[PDB]
Subunit: 159 residues, 3 copies
């Protein structure tokens, strides 16, 4: 199956101001599917630290999928999208749109996420919103096409 | 309460051929909300004139929200998106998507709006389509998340 | 009435005889509308070559609409979007979203297309997926606003009905 890395980006969480329960929601969404959580890391809202982990998991570990959560809001410090985009060879806008739950009749707060989606080498990277609820709904939105997308990027089977 | 600037981009309106009724629709959508229109300007489809007002409102007048309308279409003269995007520190694609009313069973003409959304300093800027109908419907789409987005961008609290 | 060019992007189009069924699917969607297919060509998955055709069709031939199909997937060889973007004066993201069938809960996989949409000179260019089914669904999604879009880009009129 596909090896996943979960990167939580949060100033408050990194400095111990609050606990990360978002990775727990993400794990639940992945459980049952063709996924294996190979790594987990918590970093503050700092591009330098976000990238190090992204490069590490993509270039050294060769993870198939990287799911970051947090740092995609409109707050000045939220810079996960910018950090991620700097490392992508190409983007997959369709996945970014899915994560924003585009199409719902009731305007979703998910629309405020600036998260991007793209490929670095043979690793798919998705920026999920930071809240437990947000990350969950956004991940569930892409789940239906995630396996096939990963097969195309990595070249590995799942079904 | 958030201070709003309405910038109408229209060759005809600027020429004085037909008056601007779009700002009226915008004001009505915002009515009853934590909004106060503090500035109104009318310019033609000229990038320099558009940029001039956007810079004045964001950099010196300190407005919280700038709502431009017009010049986002596919006509050769429609250059509001370009003129605006070049002044943004970062974009909020999710709001641009909401303004295109993405997801309606019947393909919307709003899909033909190239308007962008983003932040410059502590000012949120959205490019709405130019007609009263166009601006009205696109603004209604983003209204539900507008106060929250502004609180994050401006730092000003909102209940 | 708008002059349309259909460009089928692939290397498989230069190798064992086969009928281009995607090309046919596209013609069917346009049938009846203010469209006349004035050009059709096959091109390999070589960006330089894709650009040469797009360049000529827009700059020299003056086509109103260019519908490319294929090479929009997540595979390292699918570079139709990159090749296209490099030739556009401006993009029309709304059309790219329509081609991905966003929010229609019609065909989930359509969301993986990286096809772009934009204008070069007075030519509207859209990158449709490569399969007959994919190209068909993406084109039908934009069809309702395609004539209006072309009238603005080209400055040419069209009849309704």
């Amino acid at each position: 199956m596909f090896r996943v890395g979960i990167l939580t980006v949060s100033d408050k969480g990194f400095r111990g101001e609050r606990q990360d329960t978002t990775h727990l929601a993400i794990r639940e969404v992945l459980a049952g599917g063709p996924f294996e959580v190979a790594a987990y890391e918590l970093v503050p809202d700092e591009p330098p630290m976000i990238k190090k982990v992204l490069r590490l998991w993509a270039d050294r570990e060769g993870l198939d999928l990287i799911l970051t959560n947090g740092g995609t809001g409109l707050a000045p410090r939220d810079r996960t999208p910018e950090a991620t985009r700097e490392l992508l060879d190409r983007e997959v806008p369709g996945l970014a749109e899915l994560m924003r739950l585009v199409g719902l009749r009731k305007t979703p707060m998910a629309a405020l996420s600036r998260g991007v989606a793209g490929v670095r080498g043979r690793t798919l990277i998705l920026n999920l919103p930071g809240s437990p609820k947000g990350a969950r709904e956004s991940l569930e939105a892409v789940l239906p096409v995630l396996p096939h997308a990963l097969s195309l990027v990595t070249g590995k089977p799942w079904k």
